[PDB]
Symmetry: D2
Subunit: 225 residues, 4 copies
């Protein structure tokens, strides 16, 4: 337990949200590899299912503890463990839709388990758009810039996202995040990138709306010397 963390951990999730007036609760459980930047999780809609919107919008809402950091970049996220960190993000879609999500990440060292409590709110998705019509097909892999705010001991993230559409199109979404360790650290990173790759597969049956999500994320510095 480097920071209360081990090589392979279990994860528990609860999300409450509201999108275009529709309320929901999702729970989840998963397995992850903090130092590899890999996680796989299983989500289950527990109230308000079946959702009237693409599962895909919730993907980036379901933990930067799961990022592979080179030893030469300060790992702000693992350093915040076990107590953890919280994050706030706005999603600005190019069609005017707007989301906000807040999460709180925390470790139980005794259970070797990461807990994740989030709130997801979305307004203004066009009723006829690919989100509300569930015609999306995963996010394209990305490169997020992580920026230190040194007077405050917090980080900003900035990633321009593309949700691939079943019909061959792409829907742009701007992510702006604020990452806050529960204790503001004296050790801060310089700006760096984190690259991400998601997969998402619906596994819904007659009882429940269910799906499987994975992320692979790797932090790095500029490629220019």
């Amino acid at each position: 337990s480097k920071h209360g963390l081990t090589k392979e951990m279990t994860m528990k999730y609860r999300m409450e949200g509201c999108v275009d007036g529709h309320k929901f609760v999702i729970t989840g459980e998963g397995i992850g590899y903090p130092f590899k930047g890999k996680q796989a999780i299983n989500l289950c809609v527990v109230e308000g299912g079946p959702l009237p919107f693409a599962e895909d919008i919730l993907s980036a809402a379901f933990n930067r503890v799961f990022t592979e950091y080179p030893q030469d970049i300060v790992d702000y996220f693992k350093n915040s463990c076990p107590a953890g960190y919280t994050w706030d993000r706005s999603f600005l879609f190019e069609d005017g839709a707007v989301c906000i999500c807040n999460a709180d990440i925390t470790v139980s060292v005794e259970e070797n388990c990461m807990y994740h409590e989030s709130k997801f709110y979305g307004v203004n998705f066009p009723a006829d758009g690919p989100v509300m019509k569930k015609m999306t097909d995963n996010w394209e892999p990305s490169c997020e810039k992580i920026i230190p705010v040194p007077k405050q001991g917090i980080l900003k993230g900035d990633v321009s996202m593309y949700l691939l559409l079943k019909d061959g199109g792409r829907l742009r979404c701007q992510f702006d995040t604020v990452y806050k360790a529960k204790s503001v650290p004296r050790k801060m990173p310089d700006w760096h990138f984190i690259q991400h790759k998601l997969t998402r597969e619906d596994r819904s049956d007659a009882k429940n709306q269910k799906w499987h999500l994975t992320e692979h994320a790797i932090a790095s510095g500029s490629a220019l010397p």
Copy 2:
């Protein structure tokens, strides 16, 4: 009781919110004149006070029932009473801050009272900005365009807002709203304007953070023949 409404009504409010990680509950009570488009209300912070942010951001969150409508424009809001309407709005500040608010408006005919339940979420207000530093000084009066979405029996509102700053500056904020009557009406308006004027005065003491808010709003069509 035209639509469960009388010339002068009382109003009750409850808001739960979260801004930059700070949770709060506000209650309120007021008096309003539906057909004059006038209302005055008194807000009281009931949890999480004193707020770390300008009271002003909550202003447009605290009821288009209070708008003076000419007889020649369909009044979508009064027509939705007594059951009422819900609305969803994103606030896009020019400094990257983002808010979402959801309200539900409903009439008790027996009490001659309008009830207002809202949720306010805000993320990314710069810690050193006039909002988090409480250096704001009311919104400038505005002209909002109301746009019918005829396939859906809902309205959009679009208003470009300016929060005046104590130091002589102005902070831009883009409001985009979706207004939904609980029953989608057959009678719909054409696009029109609603002009608004707010006043806000802090009345805080040692016991409580408290303030007084008023709105005057008037609907109209284009001035060009």
Copy 3:
């Protein structure tokens, strides 16, 4: 000649531009009523015709001298005559397309003629969008907010525009303008609105791409006392 202006004036136009790599020159001539806020003009494509894009995008580019001002609001535009004023505007379409236009307005008192020299640049219009496919059908009437910048003796304009589409849709465009009298005046207005209504009719033949444009514009203050 109040400010070199008479009740009815003629107007001459020249525009050079470039949209998605396509260069053009348009000339025009018209008649206008400065104090009524009315103008009608005839445009003629002189190089690079037929244009590959909707005539409609050029509409707001083709003179705030033509606005009806109440005596109680300073008329910054007529006050700048005969020398005139220049203006700069960005057009931000919701599909990512971006335009810039610059105009210079000047009066010849001897000819009772207003001259208008402009530059129009547009990039990123999707090749398959209603602009490049010429499937637009005029702008919806608007309400622009005019804001004084008192340290500088210039004005800002802010109008949220809607280009109606032949198929029943609407394309949003954000106009942000800076208006600069060639001499910065001591007399400045308070913020006010200017409402606008355009008409546009193609009158193209075998020789030339030609069309007729009109504007009616009226300035006013807030409707709330």
Copy 4:
């Protein structure tokens, strides 16, 4: 002459522009290494100097031929040579300022020289902002996403930029580009990244406003397998 290109080339530049009403012409000459993604150039203000704005805004305006491409990603830019390619870009600053630039890139094989003709237009830079006050201090290195538009044989670029400020601040700017080879190729790349690093040093004297610019750029695919 792989595509009319050699390992080390000279470059000639001409730019005409207009920023906040101020017109200028800049010329330049440089040396570059197409296959290394390196270039260094010397700019000289030939009309309208000294410029009233930061040299830094012109930096990304002064040739994706200078990018190091791995053999396994199609190099759209070198493949377009010697005839070349054109590009169009909007710059959206967070304070509302807006620029557009258009360039045309072409090779003279006989002279082993790349020619670069551009137009730069900027409107709405606040007179008191770090750009108009010349208080900027270079761009932070970036990661631009390059996206193929396969029906059209063109590319899009998307990069979120940060202009560092002399006072320790940062000013955000959104770059959106369209890259067009003069012949639309059958060979197209998949989406990839290009990382960039600029340096800029003023070398102005009594005769002329002059400066030295360098870029290093390297293309790559996602780091996730």
